[PDB]
Amino acid sequence: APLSLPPSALIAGVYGKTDGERGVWKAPANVVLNGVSD
Amino acid sequence: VSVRVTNEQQAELNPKGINVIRHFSDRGLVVWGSRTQKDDDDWRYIPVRRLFDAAERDIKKALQPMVFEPNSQLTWKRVQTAIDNYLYRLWQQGALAGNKAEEAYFVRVGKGITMTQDEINQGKMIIQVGMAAVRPAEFIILKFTQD
Amino acid sequence: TTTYPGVYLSEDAVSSFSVNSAATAVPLFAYDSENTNTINKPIQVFRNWAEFTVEYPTPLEDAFYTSLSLWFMHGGGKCYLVNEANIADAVAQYDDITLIVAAGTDTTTYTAFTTVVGQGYRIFGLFDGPKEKIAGTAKPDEVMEEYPTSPFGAVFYPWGTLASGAAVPPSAIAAASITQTDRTRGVWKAPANQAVNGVTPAFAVSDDFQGKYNQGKALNMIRTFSGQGTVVWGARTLEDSDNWRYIPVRRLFNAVERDIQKSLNKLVFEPNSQPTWQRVKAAVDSYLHSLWQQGALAGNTPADAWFVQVGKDLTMTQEEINQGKMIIKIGLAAVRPAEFIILQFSQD
Amino acid sequence: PADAWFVQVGKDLTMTQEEINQGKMIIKIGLAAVRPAEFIILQFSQD
Amino acid sequence: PADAWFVQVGKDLTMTQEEINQGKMIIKIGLAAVRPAEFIILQFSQD
């Protein structure tokens, strides 16, 4: 059985890509979650 | 191949870009399609991705011997030239899609341009360089006319 | 970050963007729920003639079997087949539907057609006509209140008969004329004089019975001439207003926005600043300029043919920028068919 | 024989910069063929 | 090289008359040296 997970962990890592290339002043929305089932 | 693919589901799989091994009668098996995953017009093609990936790794390996030299002006013109003579050799062998003008590179390293005074004190250099790669030619369209 | 000494490198942040053209023809058909010689599966997906024959090995006489056999025989492509209770679901999912034709269904089809118009899915259906033989003695209007008045659709009366087999509903005949049109020369030209093959109309209508059914609504008869035969005739939608007539001028605006709306989904949540406004303005008009040389929309000095504007105080002032909105407006003048050709002689 | 046909391919006469980025390579050639002399009429005069 | 350094010595730009009577001879020179290029960042683009 697949276990659930509160998404506050892996959503911190997606703030680490947006400030890399685009900077702080870009809202992270169109970024794609990297590795999940559903 | 394990499963035989046909042209009517090639139309579906060529977007959401994934490639395909095809079978032909006269020449046998052949690879087909050269598209990467994410589909903005920045990098949709394998060679345009792999051209920028190889041009960076050769200049980054040779700037590593000069990484603590002073930030004066005679260092700037010696770096800007050794990058200029690298893209020009690569231009005249048919890899940068520019016309018979020079417009394939604008490498500049000056102090008035591309920098200013206050990031010299937290020792930096800025290399603004840019190319114009070549795209593969697929979807050849004829459009015959009468006149 | 700049933690340790060494050689760092960055790349570009954002690149260019542009719109991709179209598909222009993906129809879903009208199955019948009470039908027996068929599968109980509501939604079928057919891609070409090959799997249609292995699914249906025997030639039948039903209205849907005579409709898909007329679609594929004039070219055709990826077409769907849904029952008449699930149009409102199938359009909202498959994201490429253009035509809703009626294969001999009227009563429950007109409700499901105007449903998906109510959410604004930007679709264009097309309907059937009355069954047989308007006598023409009187009554020009009472055959026309059973049809939902909207700028989407036509009726295509005369009920071609398909002299090989049984009858064909005229939605299939009209849908075959669009297929060999957009493949040949664009979508802005009307499915109007391109001939169909293998279908003869059951009736011979007139020259003047077209005349009293050309105003108000848009009977759009199917009439056979000498030389060219069994051709369609007349491209008119249901209203008579000077903005929305002429079926090709509807499908031009219907397909010039389903490619912009498909492309701008990867540009939301982008910073509403000055380098954005000069990039969308420089990306839209580079698509219209490719569409002006092809003869789709008419006008010299191509600043006169269209206009695009986006800014800070011409539109979307400071307070609605703080709410996040980014509003634009573009306007363009399309072409219209030369339905009437009058010519004057003189002496000079 | 520049009048009999024409061939053209380029960067701004056809296939501008944005549709080069989509990969397309479009050309156009046009030529005028021959036609049979199905009807032969001939005129006599006096000069 | 007037921008690289400066040297100045005088009677009223520096060391006015009363501190000349005490014997002092004050000067000031200022110059801008070089600094190492400790961090090298490089940016690619398309133009």
Q: Could you write out the three-class secondary structure of chain C?
A: CCCCCEECCECCCCCCCCCCCCCCCCEEEECCCCCCCCCCCCCEEECCHHHHHHHCCCCCCCCCHHHHHHHHCCCCCCEEEECCCCHHHHHHHHCCCCEEECCCCCCCHHHHHHHHHHCCCCCEEECCCCCCCCCCCCCCCCCCCCCCCCCCCCCCCCCECCCCCCCCCHHHHHHHHHHHHHHHHCCCCCCCCCCCCCCCECCCCCCCCCCCCCCCCCCCCEECCCCCCCEECCCCCCCCCCCCCCHHHHHHHHHCCCCHHHHHHHCCCCCCCHHHHHHHHHHHHHHHHHHHCCCCCCCCCCCCCEEEECCCCCCCCHHHHHCCCCCCEEEECCCCCCCCCCCCCCCC
Set of chain C residues whose Cβ sits within 8 Å of the Cβ of A30:
266, 268-269
Contact C54, C106 (CB under 8 A): no
Which among B122, B127, B133 has CB closest to E43?
Answer: B127
What part of A 1-20 touches C (C-beta under 8 Å)? none
Cα–Cα separations (whole angstroms), residue B58 to B54, B94, E41: 7, 19, 15
The token pair that represents E40 in the structure block: 């090298």
- Provide the token pair at C118: 């109510």
Measured CA to CA in angstroms, residue C256 lies from C23, C26, C116, C265 at distances of 11, 16, 19, 16
Is residue C63 within 8 A of residue C103, CB to CB? The reply is yes
Phi, psi at residue C81, to the nearest 5°?
Answer: -155, 105
Strand, helix or coil at A1? Answer: coil
Pair of tokens at residue C32: 């019948």
Residues in Cβ contact with C209 at an 8 Å cutoff, skipping those fewer than 6 apart: C134, C136, C221
Query: Cβ contacts of residue C111 below 8 Å, gap of 6+?
Result: none
Whole-number Å distance between alpha carbons of C219 and C205:
12
Residue of C nearest to A25 (CA): C271
Q: Can you tell me the distance from the alpha carbon of C111 to that of C307, in angstroms, rounded to the nearest whole number?
A: 37
Q: CB–CB of C270 and A22 under 8 A?
A: no
Tokens 């921008």 label which residue? E3
Token pair 């990484």 is at which residue?
B67
Minimum distance, in Å, between the CA of residue C211 and any CA atom of chain D = 41
Q: What is the phi/psi pair of residue D26, to 5°?
A: -100, 140
Amino acid at C147: Y
Minimal C-alpha gap between C270 and chain A (Å): 7
Using a CB-CB distance cutoff of 8 angstroms, which residues of chain B are in contact with residue E34? 70-72
Contact flag for B and E (3+ C-beta pairs < 8 Å) = yes
E32 touches chain B (CB under 8 A): no
Tokens, residue C80:
């769907």
The nearest CA of chain D is from the CA of C21 a distance in Å of 11
What's the half-sphere exposure (Cβ side, CA atoms, 13 Å) at C259? 17
CA gap C90, C94 in Å, rounded = 6
Angle subtended by helix axes C87-94 and C109-118, to nearest 10: 40
- Helix B73-91 to helix B46-62 angle (10° resolution) is 140
Q: How far apart are the first and last CA of chain E?
A: 36
Q: What six digits make up the tokens of C295?
A: 């003869």
**Residue in the structure block whose two tokens are 């005369």:** C158
Neighbours of chain D (3+ CB pairs under 8 A): B, C
Residue whose token pair is 């954005």: C276
Tokens 């060219």 correspond to: C228
The chain B residue lying nearest C50, using CA atoms, is B8
Give how far Cα C301 sits from Cα of C62, C289, C335, Å. Answer: 54, 11, 16
Cα separation, B110 vs B127, in Å, equals 9
C290 — contact with chain D (CB < 8 Å)? Answer: yes
In three-state secondary structure terms, D30 is strand
| Chain C residues close to B8, C-beta within 8 Å | 47-48
Closest to C169 (Cα-Cα) out of C84, C77, C245, C61: C61
Which residues of chain D make contact with B138, given a CB cutoff of 8 A? 23-25
Enter the tokens of residue C146.
């059973």
The verdict on C145 touching A (C-beta cutoff 8 Å) is no
- Residue A3's alpha-carbon distances to A11, A13, A33, in angstroms, are 18, 20, 18
Angle (CA) C26 C221 C147, round 5°:
70
Check contact B-C (3+ Cβ pairs < 8 Å).
yes
Q: How far from the centroid of its chain's Cα atoms is residue C10's Cα?
A: 46
Chains E vs A: touching, with 3+ CB pairs under 8 Å?
no
- Give the type of residue at C338: A
Both tokens of C245, joined, read 């007539």
Residue A23 C-alpha from the chain's centroid: 15
Contact C140, C112 (CB under 8 A): no
- Determine how β-strand E39-46 pairs with β-strand C6-7: parallel
Q: Are strands C124-126 and C99-101 parallel, antiparallel or unpaired?
A: parallel
Distance from CA of D5 to the nearest CA of C (A): 22
Query: Cβ(C191)–Cβ(C178) under 8 Å?
Result: yes
B3, containing H or E segment: none
Cβ count near B125 (within 10 Å): 23
Of E36, E42, E43, the CB nearest to B71: E36
Whether C78 contacts C112, CB under 8 Å: no
Alpha-carbon distance C144 to nearest alpha carbon in chain B (angstroms): 42
For residues C201 and C222, give the distance between their C-alpha atoms in angstroms, rounded to a whole number: 7
Tally of CB atoms within 10 A around C217: 21
DSSP state of B76: H
Nearest C-alpha neighbor of C82 from the set C51, C106, C103 = C103
Q: Does C341 touch chain A (CB under 8 A)?
A: no
Q: Residue C51: CB partners within 8 Å, gap ≥ 6?
A: none
Tell me, yes or no, if B127 comes closer than 8 A to chain E by beta carbon: yes
Resolution for the entry shown, Å: 3.8
The backbone region for C295, taken as left when phi is positive above 0, alpha when psi lies in -120 to 50, beta otherwise, is left
Q: How many CB pairs under 8 A join B and D?
A: 40
Residue C275 in contact with partner chain A when CB distance is under 8 A: no
**Do C15 and B9 lie within an 8 Å CB cutoff?**
no
What's the gap between Cα C307 and its chain centre?
A: 24
Q: Distance between CA C205 and CA C220 in Å, rounded? A: 11
Count CB atoms within 10 A of the CB of residue C96: 13
Query: C196 with C232: CB under 8 angstroms?
Result: yes
d(CA C169, CA C81): 16
Q: What method was applied to determine this entry?
A: cryo-EM
Residue A14 contacts by C-beta under 8 Å, 6 or more apart in sequence? A28, A31, A33
Long-range CB contacts (within 8 A, 24+) of A29-35: A29/C268, A29/C269, A30/C266, A30/C268, A30/C269
Q: DSSP character for B133?
A: B
Q: Do residues C235 and C181 touch, judged by C-beta distance below 8 A?
A: no
Number of CB pairs, chain A paired with chain C, less than 8 A apart? 16
Asked if chain E contacts chain D via 3 or more Cβ pairs within 8 Å, the reply is: no
Task: State the Cα–Cα distance between residues C314 and C179, nearest whole angstrom.
Answer: 42
